[PDB]
Amino acid sequence: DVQLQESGPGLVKPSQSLSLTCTVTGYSITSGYAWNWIRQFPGNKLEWMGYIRYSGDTRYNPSLKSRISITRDTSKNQFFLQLNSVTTEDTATYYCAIGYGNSDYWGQGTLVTVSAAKTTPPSVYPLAPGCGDTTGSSVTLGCLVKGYFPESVTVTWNSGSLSSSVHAFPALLQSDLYTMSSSVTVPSSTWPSQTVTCSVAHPASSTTVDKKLEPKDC
Amino acid sequence: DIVLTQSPTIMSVSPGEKVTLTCSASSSVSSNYVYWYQQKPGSSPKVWIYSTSNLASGVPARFSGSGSGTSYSLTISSMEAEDAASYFCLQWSSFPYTFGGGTKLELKRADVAPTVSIFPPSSEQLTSGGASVVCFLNNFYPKDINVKWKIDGSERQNGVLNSWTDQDSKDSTYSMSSTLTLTKDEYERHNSYTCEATHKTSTSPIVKSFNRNEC
Numbered sequence: 074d075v076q077l078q079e080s081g082p083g084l085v086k087p088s089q090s091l092s093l094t095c096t097v098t099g100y101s102i103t104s105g106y107a108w109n110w111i112r113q114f115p116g117n118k119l120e121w122m123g124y125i126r127y128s129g130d131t132r133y134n135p136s137l138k139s140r141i142s143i144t145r146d147t148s149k150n151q152f153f154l155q156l157n158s159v160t161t162e163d164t165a166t167y168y169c170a171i172g173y174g175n176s177d178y179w180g181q182g183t184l185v186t187v188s189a190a191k192t193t194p195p196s197v198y199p200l201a202p203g204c205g206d207t208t209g210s211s212v213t214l215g216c217l218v219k220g221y222f223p224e225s226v227t228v229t230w231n232s233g234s235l236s237s238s239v240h241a242f243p244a245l246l247q248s249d250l251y252t253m254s255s256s257v258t259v260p261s262s263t264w265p266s267q268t269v270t271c272s273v274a275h276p277a278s279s280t281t282v283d284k285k286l287e288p289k290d291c
Numbered sequence: 292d293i294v295l296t297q298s299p300t301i302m303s304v305s306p307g308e309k310v311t312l313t314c315s316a317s318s319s320v321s322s323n324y325v326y327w328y329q330q331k332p333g334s335s336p337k338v339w340i341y342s343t344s345n346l347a348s349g350v351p352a353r354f355s356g357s358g359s360g361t362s363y364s365l366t367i368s369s370m371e372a373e374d375a376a377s378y379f380c381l382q383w384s385s386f387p388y389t390f391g392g393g394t395k396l397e398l399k400r401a402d403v404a405p406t407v408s409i410f411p412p413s414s415e416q417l418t419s420g421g422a423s424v425v426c427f428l429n430n431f432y433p434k435d436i437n438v439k440w441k442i443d444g445s446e447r448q449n450g451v452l453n454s455w456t457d458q459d460s461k462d463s464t465y466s467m468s469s470t471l472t473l474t475k476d477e478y479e480r481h482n483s484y485t486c487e488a489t490h491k492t493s494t495s496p497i498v499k500s501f502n503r504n505e506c
């Protein structure tokens with residue numbers, strides 16, 4: 074048992090407060106333990122923010138002056154994180170965790186981007202080779218997901234059927250807008266006889282688009 | 292509020308090699324409250340060593356910790372591919388509790404040239420007046436590979452957005468991705484588009500180009 078799961082809006086505008094909830098199951102948040110809220114910034118630097126002890130008294134990272142506030146709900150078994158007057162620096166993956174000794178339990182982590190940027194859906198572009206690719210032993214297709222925001226775009230091939238030899242590259246920011254790509258490789262005999270589609274989803278903008286890679290030549 | 296310093300920050304280790312990570316504190320801290328954390332990409336850190344030298348559950352014997360005062364170190368006797376990850380040392384001796392910068396460990400493997408792919412813009416994009424030319428440099432090692440974009444012999448550096456994946460769990464290789472984005476205009480104004488890859492491998496750069504022949 075003992076499970077932690079973070080939740081809350083993943084995009085807050087500057088000058089606002091970001092709130093996260095950590096729902097604990099399989100252990101009373103009053104039985105024992107300190108319930109920490111720990112964040113990881115891009116670059117990977119981790120920062121201990123604070124904790125709400127089982128008894129109810131909180132301890133806060135002094136760096137997080139009068140911006141932090143941690144509270145809980147005994148009945149529902151979950152604690153909260155309220156961080157005020159946020160800035161782009163608070164963009165980070167937030168975790169809630171506990172632990173002592175050899176044992177520790179962390180939540181899956183929740184990404185939170187602080188930005189005044191409007192949520193933009195992606196434009197998915199199928200990437201096929203030039204007219205007359207010779208066709209060696211195998212064919213390498215591609216998929217470019219461009220101009221979206223905030224982060225969290227998911228790309229699978231053929232609804233996940235095509236798993237091996239796929240390469241989803243991390244998103245780069247350029248002009249306050251993300252770009253991402255993914256190549257897949259199958260044997261020359263697979264494509265284009267068997268359909269190869271690109272499955273993209275950007276929950277922030279509620280967009281889900283499939284883009285099959287039609288060949289340019291033959 | 293002790294500051295913890297980790298070195299090296301990045302390091303490549305050959306399989307079977309003994310590596311020692313270090314964690315220096317700004318002021319003495321009680322060994323008891325010095326934990327180490329391992330973080331594989333995609334997952335949150337997992338306690339690896341607690342109280343300086345005690346191995347957490349599931350942690351293999353090739354690992355061990357040692358320390359007291361200012362210096363604390365994590366040791367791996369025989370590096371394995373699954374040991375490639377980030378190791379963070381934490382301290383909850385003083386308040387507030389602080390972490391180190393981390394130490395990323397890379398696993399060395401037989402060198403390998405990348406399989407390059409170049410893709411012209413899709414009609415969908417041109418219709419929007421944009422023109423991206425994507426080049427995929429897959430399954431290579433080392434990661435320090437240099438990618439130049441040629442256009443009718445000329446070199447174009449502005450408007451290039453690159454991206455690497457982390458080292459692969461299966462083959463320990465890397466994969467890159469260069470996207471040269473242009474307007475439908477300078478695109479429709481040139482012919483050959485070259486993706487020249489300069490890796491530690493081949494003397495002759497790995498070149499893959501196409502011409503906009505309209506098809």
Ligand SMILES: C[C@]12CCC[N@+]([O-])(CC(=O)Nc3ccc(NC(=O)CCCC(=O)O)cc3)[C@@H]1CC[C@@]1(C)O[C@@H]21
Nearest residue numbers: 104105106107108109111170171172173177326383388
């Ligand atoms: C190690 C860090 C940083 C420092 C604070 N703690 O909470 C440990 C910690 O203090 N744990 C901690 C502290 C006290 C108790 N105490 C109890 O559970 C009381 C039990 C009483 C009883 O048995 O009736 C239990 C656990 C965390 C654990 C999780 C992690 C990633 O941030 C670190």
